[PDB]
Design an enzyme around this catalytic site. Structure first.
Site, PDB file in Angstrom:
ATOM      1  N   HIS A  14      37.478  68.030  24.241  1.00  0.00           N
ATOM      2  CA  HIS A  14      36.260  67.938  23.434  1.00  0.00           C
ATOM      3  C   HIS A  14      35.243  68.993  23.779  1.00  0.00           C
ATOM      4  CE1 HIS A  14      37.420  63.923  25.207  1.00  0.00           C
ATOM      5  NE2 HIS A  14      37.850  63.785  23.965  1.00  0.00           N
ATOM      6  N   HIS A  71      31.538  69.444  24.803  1.00  0.00           N
ATOM      7  CA  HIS A  71      30.460  68.678  25.423  1.00  0.00           C
ATOM      8  C   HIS A  71      29.171  69.451  25.167  1.00  0.00           C
ATOM      9  CE1 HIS A  71      32.728  65.635  28.011  1.00  0.00           C
ATOM     10  NE2 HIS A  71      33.641  66.234  27.258  1.00  0.00           N
ATOM     11  N   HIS A 110      29.825  64.138  25.137  1.00  0.00           N
ATOM     12  CA  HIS A 110      30.404  64.880  23.984  1.00  0.00           C
ATOM     13  C   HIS A 110      29.290  65.352  23.063  1.00  0.00           C
ATOM     14  CE1 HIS A 110      34.385  62.383  24.307  1.00  0.00           C
ATOM     15  NE2 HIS A 110      34.009  62.946  25.446  1.00  0.00           N
ATOM     16  N   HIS A 151      32.273  57.738  19.117  1.00  0.00           N
ATOM     17  CA  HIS A 151      33.446  58.578  19.345  1.00  0.00           C
ATOM     18  C   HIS A 151      34.605  58.204  18.424  1.00  0.00           C
ATOM     19  CE1 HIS A 151      36.292  60.980  21.736  1.00  0.00           C
ATOM     20  NE2 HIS A 151      37.148  59.981  21.547  1.00  0.00           N
ATOM     21  N   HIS A 167      32.292  62.180  16.968  1.00  0.00           N
ATOM     22  CA  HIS A 167      31.325  63.117  17.517  1.00  0.00           C
ATOM     23  C   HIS A 167      31.696  64.516  16.943  1.00  0.00           C
ATOM     24  CE1 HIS A 167      31.058  60.342  21.248  1.00  0.00           C
ATOM     25  NE2 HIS A 167      30.077  60.066  20.411  1.00  0.00           N
ATOM     26  N   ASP A 181      34.528  66.055  18.945  1.00  0.00           N
ATOM     27  CA  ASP A 181      35.787  65.309  19.113  1.00  0.00           C
ATOM     28  C   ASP A 181      36.979  66.029  18.518  1.00  0.00           C
ATOM     29  OD1 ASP A 181      34.459  63.233  20.363  1.00  0.00           O
ATOM     30  OD2 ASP A 181      34.364  61.920  18.646  1.00  0.00           O
ATOM     31  N   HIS A 222      40.604  66.780  29.635  1.00  0.00           N
ATOM     32  CA  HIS A 222      40.576  65.553  30.447  1.00  0.00           C
ATOM     33  C   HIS A 222      41.863  65.133  31.093  1.00  0.00           C
ATOM     34  CE1 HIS A 222      36.458  64.211  29.374  1.00  0.00           C
ATOM     35  NE2 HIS A 222      36.660  64.970  28.298  1.00  0.00           N
ATOM     36  N   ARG A 244      37.219  64.912  34.138  1.00  0.00           N
ATOM     37  CA  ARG A 244      37.185  66.271  33.568  1.00  0.00           C
ATOM     38  C   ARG A 244      37.966  67.220  34.476  1.00  0.00           C
ATOM     39  NH1 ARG A 244      30.853  66.198  31.386  1.00  0.00           N
ATOM     40  NH2 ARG A 244      31.051  64.036  30.581  1.00  0.00           N
TER      41      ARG A 244
END
Ligand code: CU1
Ligand code: CU1
Ligand code: ZN
Ligand code: ZN
Lengths: 151, 151
Positions: free
Chosen positions: B44, B46, B61, B69, B78, B81, B118, B141
């Site tokens: 994603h 951020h 995000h 989300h 988001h 996303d 992630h 992360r």
């Protein structure tokens, strides 16, 4: 954006964190760089926020008005020309710059571009060779980072 | 700006290079990520391009429309996303996404923000719990980079 930040890293020991803030109609640049040799070091905003080939892929100094290299106080300068930072005997340079050409939004935005600190002093475009008119003879790129949007 | 790039780095073995190109009202995302465990990994944009505290300082995000989300194909998602990337047995994920909501210019521009990959798969907001509609339960992360302007 009204705030930005840049973390400088390179192949050597030089590192640092630079902060940017839009205050009034200008941009205040603060922070510090460590691991430098005592003395002056060129400090500029380069055009590309591209670290795929280390600091080399950041390209040349950010120069949307197509001018020759100069010092920050010169009419004829690149938008990215922030002059020199000065490191003390301990290798620390405290950055304290207010600049009238860079911005954090619109045409002059430096968001997504790269800050670079150099091996040698920037001669402010007064060296007298062709290289002076491009980079101030500041030499190699010791560390750099992409300029990001900060909270 | 019609092209951007992001180099992902972290405190472990994951690394990668992500390219972005504006096409029509979409951004085409390509590149590859290596060093991953086989399988799906959340991916994603951020909010902040702040690497002062590894990947943690990138914030949540990117979500300028204040939605929950979701997966990239959902209306409720988001802006940052982008779903999952998939690593093969050798730990390599080839990125191939075309997205209509992220942009490289304007208020939903991702330039100067951070890409994050992630530890776990993103459940696309269908996990059945509250963490699912915030982060997709994608976990920690592993690597991140600030998104910069590319030539
Ligand atoms: Cu420079
Ligand atoms: Cu994420
Ligand atoms: Zn210059
Ligand atoms: Zn999300």
């Amino acid at each position: 954006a009204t705030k930005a930040v840049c973390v400088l890293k390179g192949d050597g020991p030089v590192q640092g964190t630079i902060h940017f803030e839009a205050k009034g109609d200008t941009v205040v640049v603060t922070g510090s760089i460590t691991g430098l040799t005592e003395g002056d070091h060129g400090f500029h905003v380069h055009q590309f926020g591209d670290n795929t080939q280390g600091c080399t892929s950041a390209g040349p100094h950010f120069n949307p008005l197509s001018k020759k290299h100069g010092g920050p106080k010169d009419e004829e300068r690149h938008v990215g020309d922030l002059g020199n930072v000065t490191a003390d005997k301990n290798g620390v340079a405290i950055v304290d710059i207010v600049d009238p050409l860079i911005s954090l939004s619109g045409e002059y935005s430096i968001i997504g571009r790269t800050m670079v600190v150099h091996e040698k002093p920037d001669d402010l475009g007064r060296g007298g060779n062709e290289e002076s008119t491009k980079t101030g003879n500041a030499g190699s790129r010791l560390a750099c980072g992409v300029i990001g949007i900060a909270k």
